[PDB]
Design a protein around this ligand. Structure first.
Ligand SMILES: [Mg+2]
Ligand SMILES: [Mg+2]
Ligand SMILES: [Mg+2]
Ligand SMILES: [Mg+2]
Ligand SMILES: [Mg+2]
Ligand SMILES: [Mg+2]
Ligand SMILES: [Mg+2]
Ligand SMILES: [Mg+2]
Ligand SMILES: [Mg+2]
Ligand SMILES: [Mg+2]
Ligand SMILES: [Mg+2]
Ligand SMILES: [Mg+2]
Ligand SMILES: [Mg+2]
Ligand SMILES: [Mg+2]
Ligand SMILES: [Mg+2]
Ligand SMILES: [Mg+2]
Ligand SMILES: [Mg+2]
Ligand SMILES: [Mg+2]
Ligand SMILES: [Mg+2]
Ligand SMILES: [Mg+2]
Ligand SMILES: [Mg+2]
Ligand SMILES: [Mg+2]
Ligand SMILES: [Mg+2]
Ligand SMILES: [Mg+2]
Ligand SMILES: [Mg+2]
Ligand SMILES: [Mg+2]
Ligand SMILES: [Mg+2]
Ligand SMILES: [Mg+2]
Ligand SMILES: [Mg+2]
Ligand SMILES: [Mg+2]
Ligand SMILES: [Mg+2]
Ligand SMILES: [Mg+2]
Ligand SMILES: [Mg+2]
Ligand SMILES: [Mg+2]
Ligand SMILES: [Mg+2]
Ligand SMILES: [Mg+2]
Ligand SMILES: [Mg+2]
Ligand SMILES: [Mg+2]
Ligand SMILES: [Mg+2]
Ligand SMILES: [Mg+2]
Ligand SMILES: [Mg+2]
Ligand SMILES: [Mg+2]
Ligand SMILES: [Mg+2]
Ligand SMILES: [Mg+2]
Ligand SMILES: [Mg+2]
Ligand SMILES: [Mg+2]
Ligand SMILES: [Mg+2]
Ligand SMILES: [Mg+2]
Ligand SMILES: [Mg+2]
Lengths: 91, 50, 77, 63, 247, 112
RNA sequence: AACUCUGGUGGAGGCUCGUAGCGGUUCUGACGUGCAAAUCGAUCGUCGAAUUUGGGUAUAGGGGCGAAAGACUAAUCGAAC
RNA sequence: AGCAGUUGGACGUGGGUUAGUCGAUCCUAAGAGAUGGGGAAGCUCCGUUUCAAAGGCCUGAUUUUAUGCAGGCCACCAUCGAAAGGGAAUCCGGUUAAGAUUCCGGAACCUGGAUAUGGAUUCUUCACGGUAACGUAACUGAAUGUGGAGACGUCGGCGCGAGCCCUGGGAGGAGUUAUCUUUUCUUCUUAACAGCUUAUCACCCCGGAAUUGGUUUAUCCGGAGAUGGGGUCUUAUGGCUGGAAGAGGCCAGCACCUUUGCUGGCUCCGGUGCGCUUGUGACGGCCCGUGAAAAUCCACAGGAAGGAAUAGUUUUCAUGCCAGGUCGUACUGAUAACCGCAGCAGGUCUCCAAGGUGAACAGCCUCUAGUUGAUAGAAUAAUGUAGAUAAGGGAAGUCGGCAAAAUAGAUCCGUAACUUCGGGAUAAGGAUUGGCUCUAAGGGUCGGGUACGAUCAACUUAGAACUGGUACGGACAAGGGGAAUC
């Protein structure tokens, strides 16, 4: 069933810590515990391995990433910027 | 301590061989003044402090 | 302790120039379906291991206990 | 004698209980017994041919 | 009358780092002929977790140019590098994420990390997690490169100082609340003994400049001179302004 | 129940002081000091435990014969038959792509 | 239609009740020329972690160390012996 | 020895501690610390690889050799630091007044060294089989490099094993026997080491999957090759055998200052499980925590070098031969062997851990083992200290419900305000509970034509009748609650 209405993963914290703080940690404990898809084998088997490490259980390949997501928005912007500058330099 | 060093066991051996009373013939000597063993040690009275 | 399942290997083992003593141990055992019989263990004392040959037939036991070398000291029981 | 009485079912009423139901026998243990019974029966039936794999796979998840 | 707690940290008795579990000093490869004239290919073999550090470390194995062996370097992993990735380090390296190439041989607006202050000191700037240095300038007549540091500071580095393309991995770490002193305890247990912090106003006057009184107050001004001496500097040292950052 | 004692002067439940209660031919329960369990040799590429090689404590490999410590294939007790297969396939294919790259580069530098 | 609901499963938490353990609330109980230069009894707080602890090691006196009481630094602490 | 004492941890005199395998020794941890060098009037301080001319390993295996009058290689740079961490290897039985993993007997193993025989390999000189995972008794391999082991958190449930517990049959011995009881208690054991077998996981070969299938307690896996059919492996672990019944155990009969023993029998076959303790396996959860190091040992890559007659070399195969030093080793580990002035209700780290009740390593009772020690006797005044009870009232007592009492386990019902929506909550509040005789559900293994039965077993749940001085969480154990304020 629906065990909890809105705390979700932060029902382990009970009534403590403050509701805003438990919301802020809920939105990142979902993110750091989600299974992500691998960019090398296509399977949704990427898990976090001590923040910054994201390891795929198939094919055993490990990517550096953000502390709670595989790809932060700053890093994706950096990847696009370096792609743009490399395409400008080598052409 | 049942796992001693030889230095501790050497001092323990000296203490064992010293843990004796006065010889009785020493009290019969000419101009004897020694009455008893005044450096006598027991394990229940004074710890020898290694 | 090692067990031999071979007769010729045992017999060349008794003449190894390190073996001085053997033992013939007689067990009063039971087979399957419980009939009493006479197991015989021949134990050769090598210099590193003791080798046991287990013979469940008294005819073969009598044959090998006579085929043992005469210079080798055999204990019984 | 008390063990034979307990096997016959005596000395197990409401006032002979000091631990909870889940303390006396866990609901997880009861569930594990049930699920292994149903999976054993389903695998026995599928390998005996009295159900096919397409009925077995429905009944596996429904069990 | 007593030596105070910030003064006691320089003797370094209990205030040393807790460096048992750390993988090594995360440094760039040493500046040799290969890195100075061409490039050298290494291989990422592990992305490991450093203890007391918020960012992962890439154990990148190169070949030693002069002796047949393998030289393992410990880089700070930029966000996007993976195991089995070839890392190309040197002047003739290409502009890919993870490559280690000088600030003279990159375009304007390039985003680097683990970037040096002097050419050959093996990584100094933008090494914490999520941090990066933007390359805003070049000055080829004096071999300089204007960069923007993570603090907003504009700095002029040599164009032969190196940097690793990308942002440092482990970004967004501080966005999660620690929620409890247990999480802060285990945070600082592998860094150093800088926690828990007693406030100086809770102390006695012998323990701190702020201590004492029948009410917990500071008494004198918290803004202390830069030319003040060791023992007085317990407050806001050399503060240009105070209060909230509003206008 | 008979109750056993440690046979050595270490009285603590350390990793090197594990015991096992065993019944002796005298009929009594006695502690038996078990050694540490051995770990399988792992591959140097994938880290998976590799087959055909005995699981011994590290100085027990000096006692056994050469057969127990290797497999008869290349990279015997070092790699695990799919890592070796990948190394062979990669060694063949990259050293053919090197020849292809050599003739393409020679063509492009010989055109102009 | 976005999506809701129910029954199971699962076994999280500086979660709870409570042994060992660690503390030491109240009796302002006992004792108070004591068993004891701080204990005894009941009653209590806590009990899976900011836990409890042995061994090794480091910090030494106007110095240390202090989740801060001028606390603790060998029955010695608003400056040990 | 706060009484005593013939007793003693006391007094007097002696005896006692046996190691290749248990430890130290060796390695590194946090760290201590010389050297070079720098500082300091100096005692000495810094630093631990530095800004040092810091060096030792094999020669291709050998007579112009105490192996050099030769190459070749290594770029590291003291040492101390753990009797709980890492670590080469020993077990059973017996034995003493007191020692034992140390002695004795038997059975092993490890390291170092020497070295012979058998085997193997060799006219294709440095093996062969399997498609393969890999197999084997062997089956050359220097520098150098690489890799592995050492080498690693914590919790949760599940699986397997061991020991214990429970228990059936049988072979003994002991108890009870007015009556009953095929009964109550007890013995029925198998070490290190060795051989052959033995597995989750993992891998290989065939094959090519949607009607998606396999599958866990826990939902993961499959065209990057699932299910399925064959195999390969690690040997934790189990089984059979050797050890090894000859030992040990339980008995019987005869000997009866017999030396002090002899002879004989039996020591067998099972079952069970959310059991307990422990080891372990495959997993899962957690982390801004991702949970030592080195010694040491091995393998691989490389191919320097060396070598072929009836076996030239080489043997990580087997069997043989010799050696294993030094120190510790007795005992207590505490209500008397340690610290607290002591023979002090204090403090002091840890392993093992039976039956019942019960959720329980709680409390209460017992088995093995241990103790029965603490000045005693008499009498039963007050006042105490500890434990209780009390008619009617029920906080009127007191600064204050201090102290005590009430409540309490489990099952079912019922549960408010407020809330950060997680809680509050065991809210509050209310029924039931014994015994006996039954009933009904909840399992495992055993078969089919190229619809159903034997058989075995555990304790959970629900219900019913009957029954009793309405008792029943019958001892123990075990929340008082509510409305509010700071
Ligand atoms: Mg239970
Ligand atoms: Mg449940
Ligand atoms: Mg440090
Ligand atoms: Mg503070
Ligand atoms: Mg204060
Ligand atoms: Mg052993
Ligand atoms: Mg808690
Ligand atoms: Mg609690
Ligand atoms: Mg307690
Ligand atoms: Mg304790
Ligand atoms: Mg008082
Ligand atoms: Mg008094
Ligand atoms: Mg007194
Ligand atoms: Mg001072
Ligand atoms: Mg004050
Ligand atoms: Mg004091
Ligand atoms: Mg007296
Ligand atoms: Mg007297
Ligand atoms: Mg005496
Ligand atoms: Mg040893
Ligand atoms: Mg040392
Ligand atoms: Mg050790
Ligand atoms: Mg023995
Ligand atoms: Mg003894
Ligand atoms: Mg012996
Ligand atoms: Mg031959
Ligand atoms: Mg062959
Ligand atoms: Mg042995
Ligand atoms: Mg398959
Ligand atoms: Mg335990
Ligand atoms: Mg190995
Ligand atoms: Mg050999
Ligand atoms: Mg001894
Ligand atoms: Mg002893
Ligand atoms: Mg003792
Ligand atoms: Mg004393
Ligand atoms: Mg003293
Ligand atoms: Mg006494
Ligand atoms: Mg019990
Ligand atoms: Mg029970
Ligand atoms: Mg009278
Ligand atoms: Mg009354
Ligand atoms: Mg009344
Ligand atoms: Mg009043
Ligand atoms: Mg009044
Ligand atoms: Mg009260
Ligand atoms: Mg209630
Ligand atoms: Mg309330
Ligand atoms: Mg009833």
């Amino acid at each position: 069933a629906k065990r909890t209405k809105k705390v979700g993963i932060t029902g382990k914290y009970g009534v403590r810590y403050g509701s805003s703080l438990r919301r802020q940690v809920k939105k990142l404990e979902i993110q750091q515990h989600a299974r992500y898809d691998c960019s090398f084998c296509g399977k949704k088997t990427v898990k976090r391995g001590a923040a910054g490490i994201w390891t795929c259980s198939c094919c055993k390949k490990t990517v550096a990433g953000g502390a709670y997501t595989v790809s932060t928005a700053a890093a994706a912007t950096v990847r696009s910027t370096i792609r743009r500058l490399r395409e400008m330099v080598e052409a | 301590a049942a796992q001693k060093s030889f230095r501790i066991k050497q001092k323990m051996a000296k203490a064992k061989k010293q843990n004796r009373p006065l010889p009785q013939w020493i009290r019969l000597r000419t101009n004897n003044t020694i009455r008893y063993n005044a450096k006598r040690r027991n394990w229940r009275r004074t710890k020898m402090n290694i | 302790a090692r067990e031999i399942t071979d007769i010729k290997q045992f017999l060349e083992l008794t003449r190894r120039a390190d073996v001085k003593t053997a033992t013939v141990k007689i067990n009063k055992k039971l087979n399957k379906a419980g009939k009493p019989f006479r197991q015989t263990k021949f134990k050769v004392r090598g210099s590193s291991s003791l080798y046991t040959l287990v013979i469940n037939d008294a005819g073969k036991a009598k044959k090998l206990i006579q085929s043992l070398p005469p210079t080798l000291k055999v204990n019984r029981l | 004698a008390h063990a034979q009485s307990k096997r016959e079912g005596r000395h197990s009423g409401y006032g002979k209980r000091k631990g909870t139901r889940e303390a006396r026998l866990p609901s997880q243990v009861v569930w594990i017994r049930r699920l292994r019974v149903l999976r054993r029966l389903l695998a026995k039936y599928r390998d005996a041919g009295k159900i096919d794999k397409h009925l077995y796979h429905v009944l596996y998840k429904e069990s | 009358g007593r030596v105070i707690r910030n003064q006691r940290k320089g003797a370094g008795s209990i205030f040393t780092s807790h460096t048992r579990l750390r993988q090594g000093a995360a440094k760039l490869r040493t500046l040799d002929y290969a890195e100075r004239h061409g490039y050298i290919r290494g291989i990422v073999k592990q992305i490991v977790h450093d203890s007391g550090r918020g960012a992962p470390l890439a154990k990148v194995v190169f070949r030693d140019p002069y002796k047949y062996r393998l030289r393992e370097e410990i880089f700070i992993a930029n966000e996007g590098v993976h195991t089995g990735q070839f890392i190309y380090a040197g002047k003739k390296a290409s502009l890919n994420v993870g490559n280690v190439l000088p600030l003279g041989s990159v375009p304007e607006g390039t985003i680097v990390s683990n970037v040096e202050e002097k050419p050959g000191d093996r990584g100094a700037l933008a090494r914490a997690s999520g941090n990066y240095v933007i390359i805003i300038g070049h000055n080829p007549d004096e071999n300089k490169t204007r960069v923007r540091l993570p603090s907003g500071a504009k700095k002029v580095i040599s164009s032969d100082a190196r940097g690793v393309i990308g942002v440092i991995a482990g970004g967004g770490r501080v966005d999660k609340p620690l929620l409890k002193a247990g999480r802060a305890f285990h945070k600082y247990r592998l860094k150093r003994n800088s926690w828990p912090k007693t406030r100086g106003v809770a102390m006695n006057p012998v323990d701190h400049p702020h201590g004492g009184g029948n009410h917990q107050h500071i008494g004198k001004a918290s803004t202390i001179s830069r030319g003040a001496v060791s023992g007085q500097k317990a407050g806001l040292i050399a503060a240009r302004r105070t209060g909230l950052l509003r206008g | 129940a008979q109750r056993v004692t440690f046979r050595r002067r270490n009285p603590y439940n350390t990793r090197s002081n594990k015991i096992k209660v065993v019944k002796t031919p005298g009929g009594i329960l006695r502690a038996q000091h078990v050694k540490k369990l051995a770990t399988r040799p792992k591959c140097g590429d994938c880290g998976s435990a590799l087959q055909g090689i005995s699981t011994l404590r590290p100085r027990q490999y000096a006692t056994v014969s050469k057969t127990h410590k290797t497999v008869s294939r290349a990279y015997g007790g070092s790699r695990c038959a799919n890592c070796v297969k990948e190394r062979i396939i990669r060694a063949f294919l990259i050293e053919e792509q090197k020849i292809v790259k050599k003739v393409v580069k020679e063509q492009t530098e010989a055109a102009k």
